[model samples]
Target: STGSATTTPIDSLDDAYITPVQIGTPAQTLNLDFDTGSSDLWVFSSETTASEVDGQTIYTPSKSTTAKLLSGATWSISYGDGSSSSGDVYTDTVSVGGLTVTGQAVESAKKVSSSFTEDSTIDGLLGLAFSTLNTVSPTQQKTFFDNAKASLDSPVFTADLGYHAPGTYNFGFIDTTAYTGSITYTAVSTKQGFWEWTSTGYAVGSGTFKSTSIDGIADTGTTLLYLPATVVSAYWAQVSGAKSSSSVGGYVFPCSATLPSFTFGVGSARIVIPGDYIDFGPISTGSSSCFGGIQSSAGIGINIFGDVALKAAFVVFNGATTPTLGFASK
Candidate 1:
């Protein structure tokens, strides 16, 4: 079987993309961040302290007949941003789009960091990365995609992220009409529990393409494109009055500056990110300084091709025995 769902950017900055997911019997719907960067499906729930819960919807496991407590199972996760969450585990009927999985482990949050509590736009997160990355202890749980892969017509899922508009996530089969030309395939290394791959090279604006290989992960949860320092510095040098500010903590420039487009090669195919997309809005409300969508991955152990790059093309996460990734122009 195949399934499809719509995902939309939570804010104007395209900070994060969220999709509606149904959990438990009788169905309780919650808008969740389908994050390919992690591997645990966790949600704010009745288990969470009231002090930590803001306006976000909470899952009530007691309300679902199919919900079962996973005895002795608990989960805790910490992100690179310092945000963290810890919770008990429950298995229930979970559905995304039309695809349904029985006994899917659903981590009910007992605690959450300030960032999650403040962001009321998302009720929780649905991880799509490899199950090996799951935080559940005693016995690690499989992700929604991992559990449903056997029932899917094809063991694949695709992400078609939009700029400010709604995008689509398709499972089981690829929508040929959603992309133009042909897809370029690349072997994925899941050893690090991510959809990690190597890019052929990159080019700033219409300049020459540098034939250097860059290792990175395709992460939908991340908002910006983070690359090596040399590559990041090269891109910012072309913009007038752009500087890596100490106070701002990243590359910022005049909002009116004519930004150059960014292109990254997948195999031999080049995917271009529009200059408008790179101008990641003003640094502050009505402020003249703006942040660049691309940043240096100096401190980060690995480079990340976040939504800023993924939104520029169609991305397929193949869940076959030998996992591979496919990229195509939209």
Candidate 2:
């Protein structure tokens, strides 16, 4: 919880979107959540079913000193909340911290139900989103960064949400890691990696919305950054007297005057979705709104940059060599 608070994590990192890896134990690792909206890493296995291992995180892949599976490929996953699972496909021997990445396309889901065999804080889910938007080879095999990008030394994949112990870390390669922003890059689009974005309008101070546009895609496991109800009713029509609110419902911007910046233009690089995330919490049923970060999700086909637009910035997902997403400026 830093300054500008709300239990502070800026745009994300309560769970900081989850982190912690290592599969073929040199020491062992767990603690995960790299979901860009789901791709598959699913844990919870010890044969699970103690109520599916409450909160999940079981993956033993048979105590892999080197685990590796992916034989005929028949993995499965299904969610939006209904929940489902099936599995096969392993290439264990994974790591993060001492940097190792061997045939690491995990996912041993092993048949389950009830939103992941019932609640458990988390024992699995490391999607990292859009690895071919994979629902599991509808015929399109290979993903998990296409077989761990051949044990990355470069293909990159770094997720650093541990600002200072909110904790979240993943890095196959990205100069080993140690950053405060200084890695700016982009260029991966044979079309299907997921950061396929573009946007260029979204203000706050002077209250501007006129229709935010910056061709988008930034998804941090989504927690905010919906926008599209006509650009969130045109950004709560400038906040000052902004209205309509409900628990975590929508538009509420009342005073903090500094939220005018939704910047997006991710093809030439450009990010700006910070203004205390358009300030929120001034909810008054009689008026006085204070929640704004663009929300509507109109037709919800993909208008989510969540984590309040991924908390300012510093993402880099380089889908194995091409499908990029590298940015800096936090």
Candidate 3:
């Protein structure tokens, strides 16, 4: 059977999309951010210190009859944003939509950093990256999608993370109605445990597409689009009032600036992100000053196609021997 669930936006387009899932026999529910950037199904749990947890709900293992500890097994994970969580492992029945995977490794958080603790809305994270990226020590763990792949009608899933709107995540089957136009497919390089792809070219405003090769990962967890420093500088140069701000961290421009339209070439098909959407809201506490959603990927090692980029297109995350990325304008 095909399983699908709705992904609701949390704070804003600046925030990540989160899905609801039921864990354990008694079925305690939790809202989770379906992060394609990492691989670990961890949740705040009874093991976590009460002080460490903010307003998030905790998973009680003892409440589930099927819950079991993995002895001395442990798992720890840190994100590029510096937010992290680590804890012991628990085997439990986890369900998403109509699909259920029993004996899934449910990492229960016993320790959390201030970053994770502060974001109480995000109880935990549901990692959808390659199983090889799983953080379980001693014995590596498989992701929920990987573990349920065999039973799936089709080993594929699609992420429809819309802007300031509700999106749907489908398991086992694709809903052709979710998107329009022909879906263009491109080979993904998974050696890095991410849906990495190289763009054939990019264009700013209505300018001609430059045949510049860019190797980047499609990360839904991140909020802004990050490219090489040179690419960012080039894009901003076209804008009249755009300027790199030292105090604000990225590029900032006047609210009324006529931002240029940006497009990236994926195979023969191109996905275009509008100029207005490029402004990711205001920059300061409250003012006409705004920050550009596109930034430099200097320290990250790899470029990131975050929500600011992904929201402009419909993406298919295929799970097969040769995983492929399919893109189409929504």
Candidate 4:
């Protein structure tokens, strides 16, 4: 389920060392955003002058003696939060988690800010969710799978979802033996940019929506479920007056109540989000409850199921292949 990523608490910022490739050569070492909301590999360009990197890692392709860019190629990526950056496209051998992929796709932002630039330890994001929102341009691109897919012995990949958890996940061969019940497979709609579909509807307790309430898609880039206000309110009502406690944003309430479970129709699959699975708030920072991941947007459309909801289930995205979704072990 989009809201079901097994619980992996993201507290302090961290980074992974990624070796990017270009023209079948190791071009530059970059810090990337491991996003699950979208499937586009990107980075701040070597020629960017947006803002001081503060302490964030930056890779200059020119500095990479072996790096090369796609001629006449450029890209700009904007997130739901209005955090935008643009960069040219380039390629190189990108490596992460001690795993390396050669001749892979990659991106560099045209402009970047100190938020990422100043982080000395935190570099960039790597999307491990599903292959829904992938930005793989012909001239400029790089996906972990883009690099790892061709090299893997099975042409399959897996993602370990938690912190300090062993073998968090696996790709390619669906470990049917590792999971319970069955995997509900849904066909894709022709949405060039994101893997979007009409949610058949939702069910809470005895109440079920006969019509689809959301047009949200399962994304591997975003860590939060970006839901519409109508759905959010309805979801809250179903959970015994669950209120936003100011801790992690989204839906929050006293954990003392008997929360009801939510069943969502994804095409043909009837996916469920256990009420206990949805109850969470950021740890207290003194008296101020830090809003976990949920956020409100005046015009934002979908309810992005972030890591909080994602950790509860195993998810798969079959882009070049059959992008699928499921859950992780409790």
Candidate 5:
């Protein structure tokens, strides 16, 4: 009752977790991926060409009396994985759980790339990254989380992502019973409009942690954890039949291979990633080969601790001047 809502993931794709949100007067509901990597609330809509829209639920602004057009404004964004969407702007009543925000900026999709169109499961995206990353013209827009933060009992949210299991994204409050042990917290820098942080080091399997400073982002929208190329190679070296394939893009190994555990240093705290989680899902049907859940982020400037890495622990994305990420065993 104190401005908190716990949402369960609609499906366990493990690649990405989605939740439902209501937009506009009549409340056109959409199941969207809450992405920390981006800062735009975009959805497949009536504005999209029929050919562009696939199995997506369209949000028709005209049908909503609360929808208002923001003239001369447009936006476009591309993700690291090449998924993209672009469109005009609208101010509407957006609601998540029991909370509502009036005049919230909603980006309508006029065009979407194959990456987004191919994934019919998610009809849109709800960006939780910093508002600075927004793409609206003339004036930027704040994310739904940001808009509703002031009304929250505490400016905090928690992600309890379980491996291939149902998880909850809690808003405005931390549930102590949701985790075990003390939460390990590390300071975060939002300079780049992301919950960017530095890990002290990492280890492959039982190997000692190499004190290498890895600057990366905690991205829930992405599926895999990306580190340095050398580190990725080092981890794969322990697995039999593991190799980088031109066709497969990243490292792949036999499904039966015994993989070593991976560990990342968060300040003085250590978060361990089990080997089976590193195997991700199988790559091909009727094949014994699977893709590595960890990959190289050599050229990307920063690494990404995606769902595979996140699901291993309970995470708290603290909203503060100098935000912090608190991790604990689930």
Candidate 6:
């Protein structure tokens, strides 16, 4: 069996992508962020405190006859941004697009951080990373993809993120028409519990490619692309009025300055991110200084190829015995 779903950006900045998912006996649709960087299918639920809830929808397990509590099971997760959530676990019928999985572990949020409460657009997150990364205690739970892969035509899923446009996520089969040119495959290290791979190198704008090996995770949950300080500095140097700002907390430049495109290698294939994408947005509401989409990952300890990079190419997450990632131009 195969399934397909539409992924829509939460806002013009493409801060996050949300897809509709059904939970419990009678379908309760909620828009969830399909995060590839973490593993735990959590949701805002009736168990959440009233003061912690905002404009987001909540899942009421007690209302569903098929929902069963995982008595001693609980989960808690923290993100790179310092935001966190903790909740009890429940097993219920869950569906994404046309795909159905029985007894899927659904984490019901009881408490959440301020950042999550403020984001009215996102109800919760659906993790696509390996099952080992699951935060559930006592007994770990497999992700939706993990449980459904056996019956799927193929143990794979694809991501097609768009720039201010709607994209798609397809499971079980790769859509040849979704991408152009041939796909370039690369080995993935699930030991880190992420879609971690080493990129061949990168080039700033029309500059020559740098043959350096950069290890990073393809994280759909993150908003920006992060690389080593050396590469980030080199790229910013090409912009006329760009400089690192402690006040703004990242590299910022004059809004009028012309931005350069960024190119990264996936094996022999090259994916180019358009210049406009790098010009994230103004540093402040009416400021003339713009923040960059690409920044230094030195402080973070690991590089991250986030939405800024993923939106520029077609990414395939192959869940074969030996997991591999495939990239192609779209």
lDDT of 4 by residue, 1-330 (tens): 011112233333111122222222443555354465555666655466755455555667676655667676766666765666666766666655445565555566667554556545434555543444545444435456655665554544433344223223343445555545665555544354454555677776467655674565555445555566665667667555456544343555554566666666666666566655454443454422323233343256655555434444555545445544443343
RMSD of 2: 16.3
TM per candidate: 0.99, 0.32, 0.96, 0.67, 0.95, 0.99
Could you tell me the lDDT of residue 261 within candidate 1? 94
Residue pairs with clashing backbones, model 1: none
What's model 2's overall lDDT? 0.57
For model 2, state the Cα shift of residue 106 in Å.
7.5
Each candidate: RMSD = 0.7, 16.3, 1.3, 6.1, 1.8, 0.7
| lDDT-based ranking | 1, 6, 3, 5, 2, 4
Q: Write one digit per residue (lDDT tens) for candidate 6, span 1-330.
A: 999999999998898999999999898899999999999999999999889999999999999899999999999999989999999999999998899999999999999999999999899999999999999999999999999999999999999999999999999999999999998999999988999999999999999999899999999999999999999999999999899999889999999988999999999889999988887788889999999999999889899999999999999999999999999999
CA lDDT, every prediction? 0.95, 0.57, 0.88, 0.51, 0.85, 0.95
lDDT of 5 by residue, 1-330 (tens): 223343445444477777788999899998888888899999999998788887989899999999999999999999988678899999999887777889899999999998788778788998988999999887888998888888888888777776776677777888999888889898788999898988888898889889888888989888889999988999899998999887988889998888899998888878899988887657877779988898988867789989878888888899876689888877
Q: Per-residue lDDT tens digits of candidate 1, residues 296-315?
A: 99988999999999999999
How would you encode candidate 3's per-residue C-alpha lDDT over 1-330 as one tens digit per residue? Answer: 678889888876447787898999889999988888888999999999778999998899999999999888899999988888899999999999888999999999999999888887888999888999999988999999998898989898888887778888889987888788888988899899998998888999888988888999888888889999988998999988889988988899888787898999888889999887688768866878788989999978999998888888888988988999888888
Q: Which residue runs does candidate 4 get wrong by more than 4 Å?
A: 1-9, 12-31, 44-51, 60-65, 96-100, 114-122, 126-160, 163-171, 198-200, 203-213, 238-261, 266-284, 288-298, 320-330
lDDT of 1: 0.95
Candidate 2 residue-wise lDDT, 15-95, digit = tens:
235456667755457655566766677676665556556656577777776776666766677754356777665667655
lDDT of 6 at 140: 97
Off by over 4 Å in 6: none
Model 5 has a clash total of 0
Off by over 4 Å in 3: none
Deviating ranges (above 4 Å) for candidate 2: 1-42, 53-100, 103-123, 127-150, 157-219, 226-234, 238-262, 265-315, 318-330
Tell me how many residue pairs clash in candidate 2. 32
- List where candidate 1 sits over 4 angstroms from the true fold: none
